[PDB]
Amino acid sequence: GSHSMRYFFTSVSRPGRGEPRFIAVGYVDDTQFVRFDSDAASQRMEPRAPWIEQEGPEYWDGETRKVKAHSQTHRVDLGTLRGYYNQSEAGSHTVQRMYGCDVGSDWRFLRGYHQYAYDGKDYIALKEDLRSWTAADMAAQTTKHKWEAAHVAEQLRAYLEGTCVEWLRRYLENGKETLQRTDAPKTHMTHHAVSDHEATLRCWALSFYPAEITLTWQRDGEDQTQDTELVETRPAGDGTFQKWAAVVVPSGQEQRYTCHVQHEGLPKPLTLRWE
């Protein structure tokens, strides 16, 4: 199927408490594989998946060198942005950056991304053409114009279409057991009586990978979107994900209700019933 690589960077200023906190993480699909934390003792980029642990010291030294350079540009960015928005030196602020690439099911380049946020709101983003920028703020126009004049988009397009996807394909091959796998959801239902005239039916999907899943309830084959309580898909901590969906079923009506599960790991979508 299709795949992605994404790097996520967060720098948070801590006025009067030293240097900004900087955290970087890298993902292939839904699997984290590298991290850097400025507050950690090693000051190295570190492995977080088993298939990247065998990359070797040129990889680790060079990724450490580059991630530290990302930390220093964000440190400068916090000061630059404070200037742009005329903010005081006292408050804590947050810059976030994400970049990376998608490949389709043929493993060819599909899409790339490079975007920033300041204090939780979009700041600037590379458009889908990889040639132009979206900036909403007046302050972000300065950045946009600077990046146009320095030809930043051209540099990023080269990386996103070339280096990014070539290394994604390398990772996919080297981590074939971890990354080209699917884990199908293991499913069950629970039934808990609210009062005497109705009960909660909850449909569970556990131990699945990747995170993408659809869990829905129907009643007589009609979707029950409005009346279904759904929770956000959540990490189990072992590399798999969990989700549940619940409905309230009036007495005697359990056989009207079906829980439907779609997931790439299933040979066929599941239709489950309490019976």
Binding site: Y7, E63, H70, V76, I124, K146, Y159, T163, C164
Partner: peptide
């Protein structure tokens, strides 16, 4: 693999 060129806002 990370991008290798500095970018400043």
């Amino acid at each position: 693999l990370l991008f290798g060129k500095p970018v400043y806002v």
